[PDB]
Design a protein around this nucleic acid. Structure first.
Lengths: 123, 121
RNA sequence: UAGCUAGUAGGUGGGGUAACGGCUCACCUAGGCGACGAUCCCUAGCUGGUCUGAGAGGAUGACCAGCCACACUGGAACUGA
RNA sequence: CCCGCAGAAGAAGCACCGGCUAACUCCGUGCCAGCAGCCGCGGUAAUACGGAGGGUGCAAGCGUUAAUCGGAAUUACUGGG
RNA sequence: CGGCCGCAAGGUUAAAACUCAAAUGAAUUGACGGGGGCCCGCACAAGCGGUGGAGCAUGUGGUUUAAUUCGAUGCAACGCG
RNA sequence: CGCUUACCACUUUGUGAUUCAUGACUGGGGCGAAGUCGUAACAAGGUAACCGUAGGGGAACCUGCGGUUGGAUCACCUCCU
RNA sequence: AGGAGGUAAAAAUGAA
């Protein structure tokens, strides 16, 4: 306690560390995406999840998880990145936006298509 | 024999053709299926390399050197270093997925399953 | 970031401005500031307020209103209330 | 703004349904493809994966991401060790 | 990293990036100990006779073939069904 | 009007201070799977563990010195008032 | 009942 010391040195405030270091407050960022590969998740679960490295306009080079049943990503393909980690992959904290500029929607998606950016079939 | 690391290339499987452009100009070839241990002639036949022929007789020319001793030696350096370039399929990939450790982690999954029957009304 | 400053702390006289003053000169004095944080470095327009919060507080200062600063960068002056 | 003509005529999607957290069955694929805010799910009866139908919520908006405060008595002056 | 001290080995003051959703404390029921105590048992000791060394019957693993059917396959399968 | 003097921005030079990027190579750390060898710690972990310090070694770690308990272990047998 | 000596033997791993 010691309020006498409190007037000598005030109460501090913790550092508001963010889990998404994309950029200060940028909801999305444009990446030129290099190295489109795959990897295995951590111990309790198993799969060969598709992933890709990326390079933003500011200069950061982090990884991004490509969700969805299949993808149209190629060697360069400029994409869009959003926050959120997957917990299974050690080292990724960014989801790729399925549906934006260079990323198409997942083939034949009826339930939940806003996420995965699939256009509603009027036909 | 041509000295390599493990297959060590038994000479007699090399086609060193001397031509002019001087007898020092060698147009060296190497056969892609020379007893190389299974996956070796697999990675030496197929390649995303340069100086690789589609018939597996890899094309290298011994020019820029007038001495015949060096042309034979430099071509050898461009073989072993080249064989390292083709044995480096993504530096370390087979990629070998263990088959018995998989039953161990699956047991661990059921271990968490046994403790996930907690709190509820 | 531990000592910082040498027109710098003050006095007298001249000068100077709409006006007080190291605002500016000459001489003299040797002080002034500093752990209740001087200097240094980094960040930032300030407030009324906005949002959240039971309150105390905390984040923030775009839009409407008030104040300050700039007009391609920097320097000076004029005209003129 | 008000009145008249007039065929219901021209006008409903989006997330989610294992628990947290209101709301379920069936089919297909079988630690593979994939899901995920948190714990986790999947080895041929998966209410969690994709599809179908039904259902819960909100509604010309519905969700993801980013940022702020609260929950946080996890800076406690109010109010901790 | 820097400052300070030290002949030196270093000491002192003292971060962040990154990564996980746990780490940790006391205590409780069991378990186990190349820990202890009490007690038991062809467990060993004191004795008798066998297997494995030989031939053969039967069962299984393995192997060959068109089949050499299926299950059992530490104790608690192998003259078993 | 022209000439001349002081103050000055910018420029050039020397010269250090600070910081941001970059750098062949190198150091240690985190994470991921558990393949190589070993089996250090948890029971007395099969040499009690740990702290400080020095030395040594392919690795956990070992040894010497001092310290702490966040260590176990007082079970039986010949003997005396 | 107090108290004195004293008696104990090499042996890894099951995979983060």
């Amino acid at each position: 306690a010691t309020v006498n010391q409190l007037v000598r040195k005030p109460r501090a405030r913790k550092v508001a560390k963010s889990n998404v270091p994309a950029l200060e407050a940028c909801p999305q960022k444009r990446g030129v995406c290099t190295r489109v590969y795959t990897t295995t998740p951590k111990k309790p679960n198993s799969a060969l999840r598709k992933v890709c490295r990326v390079r933003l306009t500011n200069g950061f080079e982090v990884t991004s998880y490509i969700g969805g049943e299949g993808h149209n990503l190629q060697e360069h393909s400029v994409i869009l990145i959003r926050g959120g980690r997957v917990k299974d992959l050690p080292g990724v904290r960014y989801h790729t936006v399925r549906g934006a500029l260079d990323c198409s929607g997942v083939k034949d998606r009826k339930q939940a298509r806003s996420k995965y950016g699939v256009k509603r079939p009027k036909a | 024999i041509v000295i390599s690391r493990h297959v060590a290339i038994p000479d007699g499987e090399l086609e060193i053709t001397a031509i002019r452009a001087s007898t020092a100009i060698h147009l060296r070839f190497d056969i892609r299926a020379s007893s190389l241990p299974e996956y070796y002639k697999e990675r030496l036949l197929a390649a995303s390399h340069h100086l690789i022929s589609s018939d597996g007789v890899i094309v290298i020319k011994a020019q820029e050197y007038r001495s015949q001793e060096l042309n034979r030696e430099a071509a050898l350096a461009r073989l072993v270093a080249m064989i390292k370039e083709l044995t480096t399929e993504k530096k370390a990939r087979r990629p070998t997925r263990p088959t018995r450790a998989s039953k161990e982690r699956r047991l661990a999954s059921k271990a968490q399953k046994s403790s996930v029957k907690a709190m509820r009304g």
